[PDB]
Symmetry: C3
Subunit: 219 residues, 3 copies
């Protein structure tokens, strides 16, 4: 059921926050503190999202089906910080950071329009949103990776792992979307929630740990 | 269905035992043999639990719902050995081992009372059981980790990984419990079984492999 | 539902192909190119299988139930290449390769007979197919591992990980089979599809990445 996964999401994000929080406090140096604090806020942001959705907020019937528009409101806040874990670890220049944040903001807004518009029109917006996402794939796969590998020549494998896991996790969101009642409707509303919840826990708590392990590798 | 996951649990634990068994035999030295044998017994204990539950044993209708009280009977036997993988790898002193086993035994007995008592009374016992679990979180996170890191100074990352994975896996059990009909009832009896089965395979077969990889790291 | 997982399978294998394809192109040397190309074809083969099954092809009612015989047609093509990732990485001699491919081909054909025959007769074929699989377990666990470890003495852990993950993943297929309506019928046709799809994505996309990480370890 929808409620079950929304409550699993609340506790998992809340417990993720406690761990990153206890890590933020008791951090060795400033570099460790910033990384734990970024991840603490990401999980606090997702905890709030799931708490509102679990309590039945941020949902309205759009085009016949119940739609959690609040997901886009918070993804607009957490995804930029999730991209900052990468640029912070990589020590990426401000212009590339701006490009990434720019493309990320374009993808979510057009992605939001695809969710609230009736079909076939929504497919146009889904396509626009995917092109913005493919602009991010390129930025991380090419200029981000190159700059990060030239800055950390003994740790090329750490950035390949960061980027690849990021690519695998972020690609499943438009897939879930196109297979849900928003697209082809191959599965219900209940499966869509389970999928987004598993994806969110993985992209926030999971990537959270991966970014800390990456910093231990970099030393 | 309940039966499906109970039979997946039997085979997974049985197959886990065969692998640790074949490892116990053909072990290089005594240190490797003890680790494979600990894990062999853990999985043999879980195989028996799932075989009894799959055959419909160790279940009675308590407070209107069917309750697998046999889970606590075997968790009382396997969880102490799962804590011994940690103290064995870490080379932890007997007093700390006793403290861990003590808190672990207190958590399961009060945890068992929470399962057999009617609500609201059961919430008191759930809270007592959680405090005992938080005493274990502390012991592993602080004196266990410190002693293990001072004994293995080149392998601090191995113990951070052992402890963190242990913390993530063991925390999901009270979550599953509070969301099941024992607590808030956000999901059925069929989902509770699937969850405990996935958790058990992960905590026994999965942690089993993680503890062997940790020993290879320590050399 | 059956269709949902079949479409998740199509996209996941298609996306796996794009990644290995983009890797095949842009590969440093010949060794990297062969590995990415092997994995590119494996995923292209699975993409085709799922596309046919998703479009309702390669299925007929055998012994009362709908049976996807096309799974065995493609497993006959992809599993030999999945074994070649191992022999290619390990630098295994042609005779052992032939033995592995031989036992693999025997397992699938008898495995195919078990699927199309009525029960109890099908159990005989399931048993024959399992013995052929246990001949593969032995070959990878013993002569393959020994030869690969003597060729790569600083990378014994890489081959233990390749072999173990292969052993864990390939063992779940006969388990899924014996628990489905083909055997004991502990779960429906819809769960069987979900299970094979999760197993296939893991054994092809997942093992795909694991074999690339193994090559980075070997250098
Ligand atoms: C913590 C939340 C995360 C990491 C979610 C990120 C969401 C996306 C990458 C979604 C992208 C979408 C498309 C590429 C096209 C339209 C549909 C979207 C919005 C799901
Ligand atoms: C192999 C089995 C394992 C690792 C299970 C461990 C079980 C727990 C850590 C359960 C703890 C519980 C609470 C902290 C409060 C009450 C409910 C329990 C018993 C599920
Ligand atoms: C990419 C597809 C993969 C890796 C599938 C491999 C399938 C097997 C190892 C199945 C083996 C079977 C038995 C050992 C006995 C009869 C049933 C089978 C065919 C499922
Ligand atoms: C809902 C949960 C929100 C989590 C809030 C705070 C996490 C705790 C931060 C840790 C500070 C404790 C100080 C310490 O002991 O190091
Ligand atoms: C109606 C029953 C609602 C249950 C009440 C409270 C659950 C809230 C606990 C979750 C922790 C807060 C997470 C956060 O926003 O940081
Ligand atoms: C109903 C109000 C919905 C409007 C808020 C959604 C904005 C989300 C976004 O900008 O991505
Ligand atoms: C919450 C949403 C905030 C989003 C982005 C934070 C903006 C900070 C990014 C600027 C780069 C950091 C820097 O100044 O070096
Ligand atoms: C949104 C505004 C940010 C635009 C600035 C982007 C700088 C691009 C240069 C680069 O990609 O390195
Ligand atoms: C630097 C990038 C900042 C992101 C800004 C992106 C703006 C995208 C432009 C147009 C999207 C369409 C505006 C939304 C109208 C939706 C109407 C509706 O709610 O039905
Ligand atoms: C019964 C309805 C029929 C269902 C047909 C579903 C067809 C699925 C095919 C293609 C999915 C669209 C491709 C996904 C976009 C790739 C994500 C990205 O842009 O990175
Ligand atoms: C230190 C490196 C370790 C990182 C390796 C782990 C990589 C695993 C990545 C992705 C697989 C996880 C996918 C599970 C998320 C749920 C997806 C869904 O339900 O749609
Ligand atoms: C080393 C520290 C990492 C260890 C454990 C944390 C693993 C992250 C858990 C999130 C998994 C997401 C999911 O549910 O699939
Ligand atoms: C139910 C399954 C129970 C498993 C029982 C025993 C595992 C086999 C132990 C391995 C001993 C074989 C000797 C060897 O070849 O090394
Ligand atoms: C009624 C049908 C019951 C099926 C019969 C036997 C299944 C037992 C096989 C499981 C291996 C034993 C596990 C163990 O206890 O070590
Ligand atoms: C019915 C008999 C149940 C009594 C056995 C349960 C004991 C479990 C425990 O001590 O943790
Ligand atoms: C089965 C339940 C047995 C539980 C615990 C085993 C007791 C052994 C613990 C003592 C520490 C080991 C030692 O003597 O060094
Ligand atoms: C149960 C009995 C065990 C009590 C002994 C605990 C010793 C505590 C000292 C320590 O934590 O290091
Ligand atoms: C060293 C720690 C050993 C663990 C001993 C813990 C004992 C806990 C004390 C009291 C728990 C309550 C006793 C169980 C009564 C349950 C009655 C019932 O079954 O309904
Ligand atoms: C060892 C003491 C644990 C036993 C707790 C009593 C509850 C089990 C029972 O009902 O018999
Ligand atoms: C429809 C019924 C409403 C459901 C409300 C569910 C509320 C869930 C909120 C909190 C869960 C309890 C917190 C879990 C305990 C933390 C585990 C631990 O002690 O380590
Ligand atoms: C060598 C280090 C490798 C260890 C890293 C792996 C860490 C992954 C840990 C936890 C995620 C797995 C959670 C899946 C268990 C099922 C949970 C459930 O269904 O409730
Ligand atoms: C290196 C050896 C470890 C490799 C494979 C074993 C992985 C453990 C499998 C248990 C997974 C638990 C689960 O079902 O989530
Ligand atoms: C269905 C998807 C099939 C995938 C087909 C081809 C994958 C793309 C191969 C990459 C070649 C592009 C050249 C390059 O930019 O390196
Ligand atoms: C009826 C609707 C069918 C949907 C149509 C086309 C989906 C095909 C897209 C999948 C990519 C091809 C995979 C491959 O074979 O390489
Ligand atoms: C109906 C035709 C089925 C025959 C094709 C299946 C062959 C599979 C195999 O050889 O393993
Ligand atoms: C598609 C099915 C093809 C199956 C196997 C490919 C045959 C090549 C195996 C021979 C070993 C490679 C070599 O010649 O060195
Ligand atoms: C099928 C034919 C392949 C038979 C050849 C097998 C060679 C066996 C020698 C070996 O295992 O090293
Ligand atoms: C080198 C190994 C090559 C693999 C060849 C294996 C051949 C196995 C032998 C006999 C299997 C039975 C033949 C299939 C008859 C099925 C009849 C039917 O479809 O109902
Ligand atoms: C209601 C019907 C009863 C269901 C009983 C199911 C019994 C399950 C017992 C054993 C499963 C068969 C063993 C699996 C084969 C091992 C795989 C291998 O050969 O490697
Ligand atoms: C670089 C080494 C990393 C490899 C370690 C990961 C090992 C995990 C292996 C197996 C667990 C995954 C099982 C999930 C597949 C789905 C199974 C099913 O649904 O039947
Ligand atoms: C280092 C590169 C590997 C990182 C991510 C790829 C993980 C493989 C994803 C397949 C997971 C299979 C599954 O769904 O369980
Ligand atoms: Cl969020
Ligand atoms: Cl470096
Ligand atoms: Cl147990
Ligand atoms: Cl050390
Ligand atoms: Cl295939
Ligand atoms: Cl080597």
């Amino acid at each position: 059921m929808t409620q079950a996964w929304l409550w699993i999401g609340v506790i998992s994000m809340a417990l993720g926050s406690v761990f990153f929080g206890f890590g933020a406090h008791n951090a060795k140096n400033e570099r460790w503190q910033i990384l734990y604090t970024l991840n603490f806020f990401i999980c606090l942001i997702a905890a709030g999202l799931y708490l509102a959705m679990a309590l039945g907020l941020g949902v309205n019937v759009i085009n016949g089906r119940p739609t959690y528009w609040v997901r886009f409101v918070t993804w607009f806040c957490s995804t930029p910080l999730l991209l900052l874990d990468l640029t912070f670890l990589g020590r990426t220049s401000l212009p590339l950071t701006g490009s990434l944040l720019g493309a990320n903001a374009y993808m979510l807004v057009t992605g939001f329009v695809a969710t609230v518009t009736p079909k076939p029109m929504s497919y146009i917006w889904y396509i626009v949103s995917c092109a913005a996402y493919l602009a991010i794939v390129y930025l991380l796969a090419q200029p981000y990776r190159i700059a990060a590998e030239r800055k950390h020549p003994r740790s090329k494998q750490a950035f390949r792992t960061l980027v690849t896991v990021h690519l695998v996790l972020w690609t499943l969101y438009p897939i879930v979307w196109i297979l849900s009642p928003e697209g082809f409707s191959t599965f219900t509303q209940g499966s869509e929630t389970m999928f987004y919840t598993l994806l969110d826990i993985a992209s926030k708590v999971g990537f959270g740990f991966l970014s800390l392990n990456t910093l231990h590798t970099l030393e």
